[PDB]
Design an enzyme around this catalytic site. Structure first.
Site, PDB file in Angstrom:
ATOM      1  CB  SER A 155      -0.934   0.017   1.204  1.00 27.10           C
ATOM      2  OG  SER A 155      -2.004  -0.886   1.010  1.00 27.10           O
ATOM      3  CE  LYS A 172      -4.114   1.461  -1.095  1.00 28.97           C
ATOM      4  NZ  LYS A 172      -4.299   0.515   0.027  1.00 28.97           N
ATOM      5  CB  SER A 201      -4.558   1.764   3.563  1.00 29.44           C
ATOM      6  OG  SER A 201      -3.703   1.018   2.713  1.00 29.44           O
ATOM      7  CB  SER A 236      -0.448  -4.299   5.421  1.00 23.24           C
ATOM      8  OG  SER A 236      -0.918  -5.607   5.656  1.00 23.24           O
TER       9      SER A 236
END
Length: 261
Positions: free
Chosen positions: A43, A46, A103, A210
């Site tokens: 993540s 992002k 997230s 994660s």
């Protein structure tokens, strides 16, 4: 150095492979641990997607405010915000905030699609001078971090440099840079990661990551009191597909840096 020995000891204790890059903007010094090895971003990518949409917005004035339909086929594996807008809309700013601060994986997929696919995120990285970052997939498969798979990886050195350019440098326009920093400072997912290793009086913006293989990541810009900002990237991944997340290992890395540099 002392910090290097402590990071090696941390990795030895950790059950996995640790990657660290620290930039101290006071003197532009850098401390690296496995700094040129590739790690699965999960993540943390992002940030690059949100930054790429912000870059788009520099020349498309009202782009962040246009509605984006959230369709049932858009929902993936982890959608804490977007599942509340199925059969409705969210703006690109709302999708960026959801991706960065919660997230939300559907939100990130909408950002990727707005950029023309994973290649559009990678192209933005190249445009800002990052030759290492690669995004190859969308969610749900972005949640998978197979050892040795180069897809969706970067190096700690490259990610720290890019994060510096995006938040403290000139990769984005002033309004966009401030917006990115505001989003990162409002992250809700990072309390057990880098933030847990730092004094509470220091200001932090961060994005966690994660994935499977117990992949546990965090990338942060830190404004300590009494000194210039720091950029800290901590990547961690483990040998077993079902390894448990180790946010505490990232907190230890942050503590080593905060006490030792």
């Amino acid at each position: 150095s002392a910090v290097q020995q402590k990071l090696a000891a941390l990795e030895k204790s950790s059950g996995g492979r640790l990657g660290v890059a620290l930039i101290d903007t006071a003197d532009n010094t850098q401390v690296l641990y496995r700094g040129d090895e590739r790690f699965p971003m999960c993540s943390t990518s992002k940030v690059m997607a949100a930054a790429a949409v912000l870059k788009q917005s520099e020349t498309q004035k009202q782009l962040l405010n246009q509605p984006v339909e959230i369709k049932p086929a858009d929902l993936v594996n982890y959608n804490p915000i977007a599942e509340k807008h199925v059969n409705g809309t969210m703006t690109l700013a709302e999708l960026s905030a959801a991706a960065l601060q919660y997230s939300d994986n559907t939100a990130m997929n909408k950002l990727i699609a707005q950029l023309g696919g994973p290649g559009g995120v990678t192209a933005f990285a190249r445009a800002i001078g990052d030759e290492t970052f690669r995004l190859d997939r969308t969610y749900p498969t972005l949640g998978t971090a197979i050892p040795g798979d180069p897809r969706d990886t970067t190096t700690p050195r490259a990610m720290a440099q890019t994060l510096r350019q995006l938040t403290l440098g000139h990769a984005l326009g002033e309004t966009q840079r401030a917006q990115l920093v505001t989003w990162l400072k409002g992250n809700t997912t990072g309390a057990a990661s880098i933030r847990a290793g730092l004094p509470t009086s220091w200001t932090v913006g961060d994005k966690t990551g994660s994935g499977d293989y117990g992949t546990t990541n965090d990338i942060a810009v830190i404004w300590p009191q009494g000194r210039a900002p720091l950029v800290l990237v901590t990547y961690f991944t483990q040998p077993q597909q079902n390894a448990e997340s180790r946010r505490d290992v990232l907190a230890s890395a942050a503590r080593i840096i905060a006490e030792g540099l």
